Amino acid sequence: GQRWELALGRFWDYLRWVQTLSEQVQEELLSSQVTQELRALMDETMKELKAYKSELEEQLTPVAEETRARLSKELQAAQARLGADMEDVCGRLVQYRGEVQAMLGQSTEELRVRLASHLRKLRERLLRDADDLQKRLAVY
Secondary structure (H helix, E strand, O other): OHHHHHHHHHHHHHHHHHHHOOOHHHHEEEEEHHHHHHHHHHHHHHHHHHHHHHHOOOOOOOOOOOOOOOOOHHHHHHHHHHHHHHHHHHHHHHHHHHHHHHOOOOOOOOHHHHHHHHHHHHHHHHHHHHHHHHHHHOOO
């Protein structure tokens, strides 16, 4: 129930809504509304995660400078993986917007099927990285 978790939770729900590709989603996907909203959610998540890590560093068990230095950097990488997953989702939503324009009015039904299957794999990856990031944070 950490703050960074609730923020990731909002990003996650929003993305679970995009995954439906309902009428309102498609509408917002052709504008930049979805990627903007996701970008805000993301930024909030990263901010909170950074501040949480900073606080956690206040009550740490002391270890060899090396293991500590190693732990910190493993943590830093897990955080970067999360950010990068989020950007890859938005990137994919950008591509979809362009591919639609590229069709010039033709049916996008097949574009949508393909976007949903890819989006699903990108989300699977994001969830994997968030779970890992949560495990590293817990055993700090």
